[PDB]
C-alpha cells in the first residue's frame, strides 16, 4: 500500500522556490535554474521540438 | 542460518567479458592492427572511440545475465520443474520383481 505516491500540480513548489531566491539574491533575480525538493520526476517528458 | 555481514571485493580484475578495462584495451589493439593506415587519432573526443566504449559496456551486461543461476533461468511462471526434470519420486523407484 505504501508504495503508491502522491502527484501534484507545480504551483505550490514554485511559491517555495520564489521565497528562496528572494532571500538568497533578491527580487530582481530570475527564479529559473533552481532545483526542486521532494520531486522524483516530472509526470511527462517534454522534447525539444 | 544466521545473517552474515555483506561486503564487496576490491580486486576488480578478471581479464574476461566482465572486465570493462580489459575489453577496452583489446578493442584498441584490434583497431590498430586492422585500420591504422586511416584511423590514427584515438583521443577521447573521437566518435569512433566513443562507440567502442558503449559497446564494451553492453557486453558486460550480457555476460552478467549469462551467469544467473540455473534455478532462475529455467524457472516456470507458476513454479516447479514439470517440463524440465523428472523427480526422484518418479524416476528412481522400481517395480517389484
Amino acid at each position: 500500500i505504501n508504495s503508491h505516491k502522491v502527484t501534484l500540480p507545480p504551483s505550490s513548489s514554485m511559491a517555495g522556490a520564489y521565497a528562496r531566491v528572494d532571500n538568497d539574491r533578491g527580487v530582481w533575480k530570475s527564479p529559473a535554474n533552481i532545483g526542486l525538493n521532494y520531486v522524483s520526476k516530472p509526470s511527462v517528458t517534454v522534447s525539444h521540438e | 542460518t544466521l545473517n552474515k555481514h555483506i561486503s564487496i571485493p576490491k580486486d576488480m580484475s578478471s581479464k574476461d567479458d566482465l572486465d570493462f578495462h580489459f575489453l577496452r584495451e583489446e578493442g584498441i589493439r584490434y583497431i590498430k592492427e586492422l585500420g591504422s593506415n586511416f584511423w590514427t587519432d584515438y583521443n577521447t573526443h573521437d566518435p569512433g572511440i566513443t562507440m567502442l566504449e558503449v559497446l564494451c559496456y553492453a557486453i558486460s551486461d550480457l555476460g552478467n545475465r549469462i551467469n544467473i543461476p540455473i534455478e532462475d533461468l529455467i524457472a516456470n511462471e507458476e513454479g516447479g520443474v514439470k517440463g524440465q526434470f523428472y523427480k526422484v519420486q518418479e524416476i528412481l523407484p522400481s517395480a517389484p520383481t
Binding site: 517528458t45 522534447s47 | 558503449v54 533461468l73 529455467i74 514439470k82 517440463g83 518418479e90 524416476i91
Partner: protein, 158 residues
C-alpha cells in the same frame, strides 16, 4: 540511449535551430547503429529460449532467434516493411532464415537428451527408409520427442 544529446539520437531529439541537415545526419547514424543492436538483441533472445530448447514435453522448431527493437523512436521509418516488427517469428524467418539448419541441430539436441537416460535411437536413421522417403526427417524427430515424454513408464514397467 547511451550516447549524449549532442549526437541527436536520444528521446528528446535535436533543437530545430540546428537545421535540417543535422537532423538528417542523425537519421543516418541511427541506421548504422542498428547493425550492432540487432545482434545483441539476438543473444538476449536466445537466453529466453533455453527452457524450450531442452524441454521434455516439446522443443521449438527453430534453433536461432531474434527480436523486434521498439525503444527507438523512428523504427517505423527506418525499416522498409514495419510489418515484421509486429511478429518476432516472421522477423526470424526474414533475418536469419536458412542460416538455421534446423534438422541437423534439432537432432543433436534430442540425441543428447536421450543419451542422458542411456538410450539410443541410431537405427531409425535407416530403418525408416524402408517405409518413407524424404519425409523421414520430420517423422523421426516427432518419434524422439514422444519417447522422452513417455519415458517414466517405459523404463519402469518392463
Amino acid at each position: 540511449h547511451e550516447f549524449p544529446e549532442t549526437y541527436g539520437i536520444s528521446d528528446i531529439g535535436l533543437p530545430p535551430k540546428l537545421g535540417v541537415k543535422r537532423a538528417v545526419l542523425a537519421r543516418q547514424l541511427k541506421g548504422y547503429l542498428l547493425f550492432f543492436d540487432q545482434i545483441l538483441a539476438s543473444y538476449f533472445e536466445h537466453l529466453s529460449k533455453i527452457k524450450s530448447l531442452l524441454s521434455l514435453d516439446q522443443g521449438p522448431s527453430f534453433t536461432y532467434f531474434t527480436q523486434a527493437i521498439k525503444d527507438i523512436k523512428d523504427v517505423e521509418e527506418l525499416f522498409k516493411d514495419p510489418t515484421l516488427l509486429e511478429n518476432d517469428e516472421e522477423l526470424t524467418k526474414s533475418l536469419i532464415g536458412k542460416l538455421d539448419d534446423t534438422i541437423e541441430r534439432r537432432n543433436q539436441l534430442m540425441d543428447h537428451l536421450i543419451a542422458r537416460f542411456a538410450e539410443n535411437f541410431s537405427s531409425y536413421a535407416f530403418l525408416m527408409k524402408f517405409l518413407y522417403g524424404e519425409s523421414t526427417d520430420e517423422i523421426v524427430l516427432q518419434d524422439k520427442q514422444s519417447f522422452l515424454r513417455e519415458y517414466k513408464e517405459i523404463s519402469r514397467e518392463r
